[PDB]
Paper text:
The bacterial member PspA is part of the phage shock protein (psp) response that maintains structural integrity of membranes under stress conditions such as temperature and infection. The main effector of the Psp system is PspA, a 25 kDa protein consisting of six α-helices connected by short loops and an elongated hairpin, where the N-terminal helix α0 of the protein remains unfolded in the absence of membranes. Interestingly, PspA is related to eukaryotic and archaeal endosomal sorting complexes required for transport (ESCRT)-III proteins and has a similar structure. Here, we show that rods of bacterial ESCRT-III protein PspA internalize and thin membrane tubules by overcoming the required bending energy through progressive membrane binding of the N-terminal helix in the PspA assembly.
For our analyses, we refolded PspA in the presence of 50 nm sized small unilamellar EPL vesicles, similar to a recently described protocol. In the presence of EPL membranes, the rods had a wider diameter and a broader diameter distribution (200 to 345 Å) in comparison with the diameter values and distribution of the previously analyzed apo protein (180 to 290 Å). By segmenting the rods of the EPL-PspA sample and sorting the segments according to diameter through classification, we determined a total of 10 cryo-EM structures with resolutions ranging from 4.7 to 6.5 Å. While the imposed helical symmetry parameters suggested no architectural relationship between the PspA rods, helical lattice plots revealed that the left-handed helical rung corresponding to layer line ~110 Å in the power spectrum increased in Bessel order from n = 10, 11, 12…18 with increasing diameters of 200, 215, 235…345 Å, respectively. Upon insertion of an additional subunit into the helical rung, the assembly widens in discrete steps of around 20 Å up to a diameter of 345 Å. The rods with diameters larger than 280 Å were of particular interest as they showed enclosed double-layered lipid density in the cross-sectional top and side views in addition to the expected PspA protein densities, whereas rods of 270 Å diameter contained only partial lipid density and smaller diameters showed no density in the cross-section views. When comparing them with the previous apo structures, we observed that the structures of the EPL sample were identical to the apo structures with the same diameters, including their respective helical symmetry. The cryo-EM structures and MD simulations showed that only rods wider than 270 Å internalize and tubulate membranes. As indicated in the simulations, the energy required for membrane bending likely is too high for thinner rods to bend and internalize membrane tubules.
Author numbering:
A (entry chain J): 77 to 125
B (entry chain I): 22 to 174
C (entry chain H): 126 to 217
D (entry chain p), E (entry chain G): 175 to 217
The structure:
Amino acid sequence: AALDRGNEQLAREALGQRQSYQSHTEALGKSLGEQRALVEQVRGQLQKL
Amino acid sequence: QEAPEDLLERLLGEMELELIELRRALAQTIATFKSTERQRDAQQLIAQRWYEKAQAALDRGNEQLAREALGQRQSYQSHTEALGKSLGEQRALVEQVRGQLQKLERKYLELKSQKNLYLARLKSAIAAQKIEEIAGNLDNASASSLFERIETK
Amino acid sequence: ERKYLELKSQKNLYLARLKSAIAAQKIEEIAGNLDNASASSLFERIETKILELEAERELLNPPPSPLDKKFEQWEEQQAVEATLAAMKARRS
Amino acid sequence: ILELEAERELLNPPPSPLDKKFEQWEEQQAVEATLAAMKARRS
Amino acid sequence: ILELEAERELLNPPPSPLDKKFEQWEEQQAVEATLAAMKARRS
């Protein structure tokens, strides 16, 4: 709708708005991955005990 | 310096009260920043009123009073300029302060996200440091394990 | 009085900035940046210490030798293949 | 009383000034759209 | 207050002035890329 109504200037503003979240998604897009492989290692230790 | 894990838990506790203390202080500037801003308008308002009367000062053939009226406002004219720039300086400063605060909260939560993820690993080793000591492995027969001490006695 | 109020107007505006730095002086010290790995950050001290205990288990009672895994992995193939080998004949 | 006003405006920030445009700029489409079909629907 | 500002800027140095270019110079590609496909995607 930003560009559909001949308001592409707003679309650029809209497009730049999301980039803030794009970095945030990537920022937290990898923190989860690191935790995932770590806990499963912790799980293995507990079962043996 | 207590145990590294013990200090961390306490350290984060005092961090929470820190931000909210900073939370209150920043709000004070916003209130005062507005209060002075409003104060300026009222001060500018009253001074503007005097100029309005200047029409009647000269309308009734009393221009001598108009000069007195005109000189009266000049006192407020300087005052308006005096406070006309103090607000401008404060405006650009607080917004910089605002930027700093947001990162701390965003930073603060992410640090805490991994706080417990290490505590469990820490307690994995401590439990994974005792069982062997109690019994050990029969291949070596250390005899330091309390279990062996039972056998020898 | 005119001077007094204006001075006070800026009193708090500096206190918030002052408390910005003190809070902006601790977070890095607690954790720092992973690129440098200062190890002065309390967070790193946790990482190094946990490693030390890992050595005790791996050293006081050594884990199975790397060969030991082969002797058990190389033979499990015989076990799994043996059971299915008889399974095919047993099925027939 | 002003101090508390900041907490609401800061602790949970209000919608951005742009956000009002994204909703005000589109409500015109909604109101105009319904009446646009209304005229044709009437006919 | 200035003295503490140095610690953050020095103990953990901020991104290099170049680093801003590497991220600013590429964001233009990102923003232009999405709208470039948007025009074709719209058509």
